[PDB]
From Swiss-Prot, chain A:
Organism per entry: Homo sapiens (Human)
Residues carrying N-acetylserine: 1
Quaternary assembly: Component of the mitochondrial large ribosomal subunit (mt-LSU). Mature mammalian 55S mitochondrial ribosomes consist of a small (28S) and a large (39S) subunit. The 28S small subunit contains a 12S ribosomal RNA (12S mt-rRNA) and 30 different proteins. The 39S large subunit contains a 16S rRNA (16S mt-rRNA), a copy of mitochondrial valine transfer RNA (mt-tRNA(Val)), which plays an integral structural role, and 52 different proteins. Interacts with OXA1L.
Family: Belongs to the universal ribosomal protein uL13 family.
Subcellular location: Mitochondrion
Annotated protein name in UniProt: Large ribosomal subunit protein uL13m
From Swiss-Prot, chain B:
UniProt function note: Component of the 39S subunit of mitochondrial ribosome. May have a function in the assembly/stability of nascent mitochondrial polypeptides exiting the ribosome.
Domain of life: Eukaryota
Gene3D superfamilies: 3.30.160.20, Ribonuclease III domain (1.10.1520.10)
Subcellular location: Mitochondrion
Domain RNase III: 56-187
DRBM domain segment(s): 195-265
UniProt record, GO biological process: mitochondrial translation; mitochondrial translational elongation; RNA processing
UniProtKB keywords: Disease variant, Endonuclease, Hydrolase, Mitochondrion, Nuclease, Primary mitochondrial disease, Ribonucleoprotein, Ribosomal protein, RNA-binding, Transit peptide
Protein name as catalogued: Large ribosomal subunit protein mL44
Keyword Cytoplasm: no
From Swiss-Prot, chain E:
Source organism: Homo sapiens (Human)
Family: Belongs to the mitochondrion-specific ribosomal protein mL43 family.
Bilayer-crossing regions: none
Transit peptide found in the keyword field: yes
Organism lineage: Eukaryota, Metazoa, Chordata, Craniata, Vertebrata
Encoding gene (name): MRPL43
Stated name of the protein: Large ribosomal subunit protein mL43
Major localization class: mitochondrion
Cell compartments where the protein resides: Mitochondrion
Tissue: High relative levels in skeletal muscle and testis. Lower levels of expression in the heart, brain, placenta, lung, liver, kidney, pancreas, spleen, thymus, prostate, ovary, small intestine, colon and leukocytes. Expression is coregulated with TWNK.
Swiss-Prot record, chain F:
Keywords: Mitochondrion, Ribonucleoprotein, Ribosomal protein, Transit peptide
Portion of the full sequence shown: 35 to 142 of 142
Domain of life: Eukaryota
Record has Ribonucleoprotein as a keyword: yes
BP-aspect Gene Ontology terms: mitochondrial translation; translation
Chief place where the protein resides: mitochondrion
GO molecular function, one term: structural constituent of ribosome
Protein name: Large ribosomal subunit protein mL42
Organism: Homo sapiens (Human)
């Protein structure tokens, strides 16, 4: 690691902006992958108390 | 009134307990408080931390010059600890520098000594000594004792320990206790620095390599109020360090800090101190 | 009953040194067994708390209420009290800090309802307490700006950490 | 009166002492706290099994997440682990993914290789050289 | 109760594990009496085991008041100064021996709920996880749907 | 040449067994970010303020309102720090 | 909409529960191992008149041990030691 405390904690719980193209896709499957990415379940450090969610953009 | 006094007794214990919490008295020395024997305590204390030597050297270390002023003052109305503290802190500085430079030859004499000055500082030494009951044995004029006076008494114990046991046992003492407090805090927590990338380019010229360039590798939330950049420092198209940060400047200086740790060998994933 | 509020004036702090912060002299005063409901003048106590006395004299004496006449006569009699025998330089450069009210020794009577039933009527007496402190009054804490909102939230995101883990 | 309890004051205070943090008239009065203090204690007991189930299922979501990042799913993952004889519970398996994803990548790479070995075994059960990692240790 | 009681992260007093171990019990102050039937356990404990307890632990210091007391007490303070008193009223010698032994074993920090059952000073090796650990980069460093 | 996962984003991974076949070893040095995969470096009131910072932080307006003194006093002032 | 008469699990009309392949796979596993059982407890080792009087010794001596355990029922033994140790509550120093 060799990272400082506050910068390392910031990068871990930071948010990220996903992008998705909805051309010829069903609203459910894009919703299924999106919803898990909204709580931050994809993050191995997930916890419901910590709002570690990430943004999602659909087109 | 209903009969009985047992309930009224324990209630007075509850009243004085609340009166204690409401208006507590100021603290005092443990010698003032009951159940105290002076000679037996330093003896029992010496056996606690596994040290055995003459009481003349012990009492001379715990005694300060300030208490002698009040002692003779109250007498009208013996030996200080300056020499012991002098030799104590002298050997500690040389010994701490010895083990640190042997483990980290890459660290310069400037930064390695500032760390030794920190571990031998007031807040660190007094915290170790406060949690080793040196405050109860030390005697001064004012209570709570100052940190500088308590610091002098601590090294005075190191001096008396040096004269009796030897350097090897004194080395084992200061090595074990102080370094364990160093395990927690990383370099730039106690040893703060200015212009890290400037110091980085200075160090890299000593190591005979080119001037690196800062380049953002990854980005997120740039226009957002939570910017995030992964800045990496490359020289000759080869990377050394990568550092996150809020802005490009915070990520740049952080990446400069990341290189300084591994350059001096103070990485978080380095070999812990053997015993 | 209890009358500690009068004993609060009897304390005596030790002498202060030359090179130390000038202490603001406090002083207490109250009135006992007034004919006015506890919750009523508590509104008046909520008004005056956090302003200056002479500015407070203006508000209540224009306030069309009975309690104001009762809690103004306690104010300026605490004003001239504080200067005559408590060493207050300015009768105006001071600020009230604690103004509250409380129940008193009430009195119960009977009100005659219809069909023979009776209703217990409680007459209300109260005790009004006021504390004065010299020096100018403190300014009101303004509403927290967007910078305070932002920094508090970033501090929350910086202070949080992983849980149920190594 | 000849016999009267004198320490009624204390046996209720210990109840209210635990119930100070309650809201409303519960922390002040006694009987309101008696209804809630035992109920709060009862919920504390069986909440352990909820703590077990919640934290257990939480580790499943974590390991399921790190596996999907590397291109696998949790049910196939642990199947390869126990097949390859590594008894790492869900705590360390999750916690390993937190601090060393390089290690968890090796666990996933170890797991994915066992799947191809298992599918190769699905084609031919015997009559072939067994998988190198699918080989087992025999204790006796 | 966890929420009503305070809590803490697990930690030791000045890292007593690596270096030389030190018995973190500083002092024991027994309060017994020449009378009172409840003091039979403490006095017989003073006769037999308190002697051997001192021989076993030269570091710890012991004091005995031996004053009139309706209830015997035993007070124990540690290096940090955390005082902890327990009642030995009407207790057997065997229970008191185990009680004084565990007092010698434990450290000077208040027994409360622990936030977690361990503590790691350097938990991170190979770099702690951030979102960009397990995904690749882009040629020329380009975001999705970007020309230049 | 066959690989179980693409070794181009996290680390170059390769597994290995001792010849007896009782222990498994791994070698995973981290990837080096190429130079090509980089870039060069270069008042108001309650209503308007609570919504604009909500649009700025991408969150709701509820948490920004002030809480009561009941919760402000229950907040711990000396929380424990780990590591 | 979609209610049902009375209780959900009794009466002339209740909620019609249906089967899943999970429960099917579960119960066939229980009776197929029972078919493995049905094979094993067949082909006995000994005959009826072979195993007639082989264990009567153990069942007799075992029951006699229960008889001795039942007869062995009395109050415990009293002593002057445990009686006079109560006197030691007033042991006090000189
Ligand atoms: N209404 C009310 N006033 C109180 C209470 N405790 C104290 N006070 C007021 O504060 C004064 C000083 O009390 P002490 O400083 O606690 C009292 O004389 C009384 O006027 C309480 O519980 N309720
Ligand atoms: Mg009524
Ligand atoms: Mg389970
Ligand atoms: Mg129904």
């Amino acid at each position: 690691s060799s990272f400082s405390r506050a910068p390392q904690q910031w990068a871990t719980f930071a948010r990220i902006w996903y992008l998705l193209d909805g051309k010829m896709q069903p609203p459910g499957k894009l919703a299924a992958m999106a919803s898990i990415r909204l709580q931050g379940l994809h993050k191995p450090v997930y916890h419901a108390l910590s709002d570690c969610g990430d943004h999602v953009v659909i087109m | 009134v209903k009969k009985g006094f047992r309930a009224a007794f324990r209630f007075q214990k509850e009243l004085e307990r609340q009166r204690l919490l409401r208006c507590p008295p100021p603290p005092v020395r443990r010698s003032e408080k009951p159940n105290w024997d002076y000679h037996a305590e330093i003896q029992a204390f010496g056996h606690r931390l596994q040290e055995n030597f003459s009481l003349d050297l012990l009492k001379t270390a715990f005694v300060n010059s300030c208490y002698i002023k009040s002692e003779e003052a109250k007498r009208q109305q013996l030996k200080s600890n300056q020499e012991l503290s002098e030799q104590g802190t002298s050997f500690s500085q040389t010994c701490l520098t010895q083990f640190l430079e042997d483990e980290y030859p890459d660290m310069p004499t400037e930064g390695i000594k500032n760390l030794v000055d920190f571990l031998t500082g007031e807040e660190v030494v007094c915290h170790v000594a406060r949690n080793l009951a040196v405050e109860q044995l030390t005697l001064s004029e004012e209570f709570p004792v100052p940190p500088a006076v308590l610091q002098q008494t601590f090294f005075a114990v190191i001096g008396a320990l040096l004269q009796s046991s030897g350097p090897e046992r004194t080395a084992l003492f200061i090595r074990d206790f102080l370094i364990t407090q160093m395990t927690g805090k990383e370099l730039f927590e106690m040893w703060k620095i200015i212009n890290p990338m400037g110091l980085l380019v200075e160090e890299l010229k000593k190591r005979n390599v080119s001037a690196p360039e800062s380049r953002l590798t990854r980005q997120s939330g740039g226009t957002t109020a939570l910017p995030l950049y992964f800045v990496g420092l490359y020289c000759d198209k080869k990377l050394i360090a990568e550092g996150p940060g809020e802005t490009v400047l915070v990520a740049e200086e952080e990446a400069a800090r990341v290189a300084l740790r591994k350059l001096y060998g103070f990485t978080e994933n380095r070999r812990p101190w053997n015993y | 009953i209890s009358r500690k509020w009068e004993k609060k004036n009897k304390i005596v702090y030790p002498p202060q040194l030359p090179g130390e912060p000038r202490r603001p002299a406090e002083i207490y005063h109250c009135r006992r067994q007034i004919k006015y409901s506890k919750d009523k003048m508590w509104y008046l106590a909520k008004l005056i708390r956090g302003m200056s006395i002479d500015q407070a004299l203006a508000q209540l004496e224009f306030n069309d209420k009975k309690g104001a006449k009762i809690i103004k006569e306690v104010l300026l009699e605490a004003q001239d009290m504080a200067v005559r025998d408590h060493n207050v330089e300015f009768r105006s450069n001071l600020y009230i800090a604690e103004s509250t009210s409380g129940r008193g020794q009430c009195l119960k009577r009977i009100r005659y309802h219809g069909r023979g039933r009776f209703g217990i009527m409680e007459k209300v007496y109260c005790h009004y307490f006021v504390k004065l402190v010299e020096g100018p009054p403190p300014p009101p804490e303004p509403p927290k700006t967007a910078v305070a909102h932002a920094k508090e939230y970033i501090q929350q995101l910086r202070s949080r950490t992983i849980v149920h883990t190594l | 009166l000849r016999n009267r309890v004198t320490d009624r004051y204390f046996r209720i205070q210990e109840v209210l002492k635990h119930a100070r943090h309650f809201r409303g008239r519960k922390n002040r009065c006694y009987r309101l706290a008696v209804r809630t203090v035992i109920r709060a204690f009862v919920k504390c007991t069986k909440a352990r099994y909820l703590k077990k189930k919640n934290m257990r299922t939480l580790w499943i979501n974590r390991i399921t997440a790190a596996s999907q990042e590397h291109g696998l799913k949790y049910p196939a993952l642990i199947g390869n682990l126990v097949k390859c004889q590594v008894e790492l519970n869900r705590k360390v398996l999750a916690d390993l993914a937190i601090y060393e994803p390089k290690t968890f990548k090796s666990l996933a790479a170890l797991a994915s290789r066992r799947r191809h070995e298992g599918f190769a075994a699905a084609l031919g059960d015997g009559k072939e050289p067994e998988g190198i990692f699918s080989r087992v240790v025999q204790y006796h | 109760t966890a929420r009503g009681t305070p809590s803490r992260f697990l930690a030791s007093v000045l890292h007593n594990g690596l270096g030389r171990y030190v018995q973190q019990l500083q002092r024991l102050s027994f309060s017994v009496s020449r009378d009172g039937a409840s003091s039979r356990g403490a006095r017989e404990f003073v006769e037999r085991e308190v002697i051997d307890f001192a021989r076993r632990n030269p570091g710890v210091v012991i004091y005995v008041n031996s004053r009139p007391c309706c209830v015997p007490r035993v007070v124990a303070e540690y290096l940090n100064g955390a005082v902890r008193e327990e009642s030995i009223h009407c207790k057997s010698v065997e229970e008191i021996s185990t009680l004084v032994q565990k007092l010698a074993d434990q450290s000077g920090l208040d027994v409360i709920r622990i936030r977690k059952p361990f503590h790691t000073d350097n938990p991170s090796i190979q770099g702690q996880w951030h979102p960009f650990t397990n995904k690749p980069t882009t040629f020329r460093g380009l975001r999705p749907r970007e020309v230049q | 040449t066959y690989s179980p996962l693409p070794d181009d984003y996290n680390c170059n991974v390769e597994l290995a067994l001792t010849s007896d076949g009782r222990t498994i070893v791994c070698y995973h040095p981290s990837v080096d970010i190429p130079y090509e995969h980089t870039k060069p470096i270069p008042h108001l009131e309650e209503g308007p303020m609570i919504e604009q910072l909500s649009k700025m932080f991408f969150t709701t307006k509820h948490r920004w309102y002030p809480h009561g003194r009941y919760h402000r006093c229950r907040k711990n002032l000396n929380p424990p720090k780990d590591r | 909409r979609g209610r049902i008469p009375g209780r959900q699990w009794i009466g002339k009309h209740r909620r019609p529960r249906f089967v899943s392949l999970r429960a099917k796979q579960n119960m066939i596993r229980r009776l197929e191992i029972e078919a493995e059982n049905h094979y094993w407890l067949s082909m006995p080792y000994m005959t009826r008149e072979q195993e007639r009087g082989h264990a009567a010794v153990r069942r007799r001596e075992a029951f006699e041990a229960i008889k001795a355990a039942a007869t062995s029922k009395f109050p415990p033994h009293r002593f002057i030691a445990d009686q006079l140790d109560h006197l030691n509550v007033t042991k006090k120093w000189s």
